[PDB]
Amino acid sequence: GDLADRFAELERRYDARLGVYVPATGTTAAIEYRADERFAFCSTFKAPLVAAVLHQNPLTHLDKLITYTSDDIRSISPVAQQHVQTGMTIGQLCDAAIRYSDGTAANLLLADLGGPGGGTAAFTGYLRSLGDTVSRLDAEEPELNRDPPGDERNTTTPHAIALVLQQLVLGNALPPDKRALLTDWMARNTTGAKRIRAGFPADWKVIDKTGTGDYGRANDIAVVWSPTGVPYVVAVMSDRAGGGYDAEPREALLAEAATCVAGVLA
Numbered sequence: 001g002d003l004a005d006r007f008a009e010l011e012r013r014y015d016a017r018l019g020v021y022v023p024a025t026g027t028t029a030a031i032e033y034r035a036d037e038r039f040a041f042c043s044t045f046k047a048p049l050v051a052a053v054l055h056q057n058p059l060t061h062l063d064k065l066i067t068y069t070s071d072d073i074r075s076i077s078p079v080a081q082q083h084v085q086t087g088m089t090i091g092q093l094c095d096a097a098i099r100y101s102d103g104t105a106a107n108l109l110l111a112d113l114g115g116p117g118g119g120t121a122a123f124t125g126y127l128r129s130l131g132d133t134v135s136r137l138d139a140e141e142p143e144l145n146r147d148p149p150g151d152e153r154n155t156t157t158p159h160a161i162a163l164v165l166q167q168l169v170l171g172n173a174l175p176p177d178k179r180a181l182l183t184d185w186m187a188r189n190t191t192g193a194k195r196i197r198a199g200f201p202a203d204w205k206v207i208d209k210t211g212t213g214d215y216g217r218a219n220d221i222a223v224v225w226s227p228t229g230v231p232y233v234v235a236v237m238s239d240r241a242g243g244g245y246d247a248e249p250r251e252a253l254l255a256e257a258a259t260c261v262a263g264v265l266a
């Protein structure tokens with residue numbers, strides 16, 4: 001259709017590979033572009049990671065204090081690295097993992113799921129439990145960013161991650177109370193002003209989880225509400241693998257992709 005051609009023009013203009021998935025609703029068709037193609041998760045996994053922790057524990061667990069050392073700061077950790085002396089509660093870790101993409105928080109929450117591979121296996125299994133047979137997490141931060149194009153490790157697809165997020169925020173994967181916490185953390189995200197948010201009019205609400213990696217990898221997964229309160233899930237994934245491991249990620253690609261989506265859903 002014409003929208004596919006426009007996504008293709010966007011890819012050509014940015015010298016990038018773009019993936020888009022907006023699940024169909026009772027009133028709207030799905031928007032799909034390279035939606036069954038694999039893209040690195042990057043920091044986007046930190047949102048479903050928080051859902052896994054929520055899922056597996058009573059809410060009182062959020063008050064559990066976790067201590068760690070400066071040697072645990074092995075990845076970009078804007079919150080955790082300033083709380084080595086105090087520790088952080090599981091809830092604070094969930095907050096940081098989503099709103100600041102905190103990698104140490106992510107690793108600690110992975111550990112909290114238990115089992116081999118520092119909780120990476122358990123994370124993947126959580127996604128399996130939501131019907132996702134595609135996504136896989138194989139390493140902790142930062143080593144999960146190291147995989148070259150073509151390697152299936154630490155990848156998802158726009159389709160798979162969109163349907164995960166759909167079930168988590170809009171569906172019944174979580175009880176409404178836990179769902180509200182996940183939603184609130186994504187709502188107050190600090191990292192996403194220049195991506196999906198930048199492509200929707202100000203009277204639309206946007207909650208989201210960003211990620212950035214090597215090979216120009218830039219993702220955003222969002223739930224948006226129209227001015228009338230109609231929700232949609234918008235997953236946008238990109239890389240610029242053609243330019244090499246140090247290709248510049250382009251936030252503006254995601255904003256423009258989201259603009260194209262907002263045009264269809266207005």
Ligand SMILES: O=C(O)C[C@@H]1CC[C@H](NC(=O)Cc2cccs2)B(O)O1
Nearest residue numbers: 042043076101191210211212213214
């Ligand atoms: O939310 C965002 O968009 C940024 C977030 C930062 C932590 C994670 N990145 C890393 O830890 C290393 C990186 C490689 C290339 C860039 S940062 B994550 O994937 O992305």
Ligand code: NA
Nearest residue numbers: 081082083084
């Ligand atoms: Na500190």
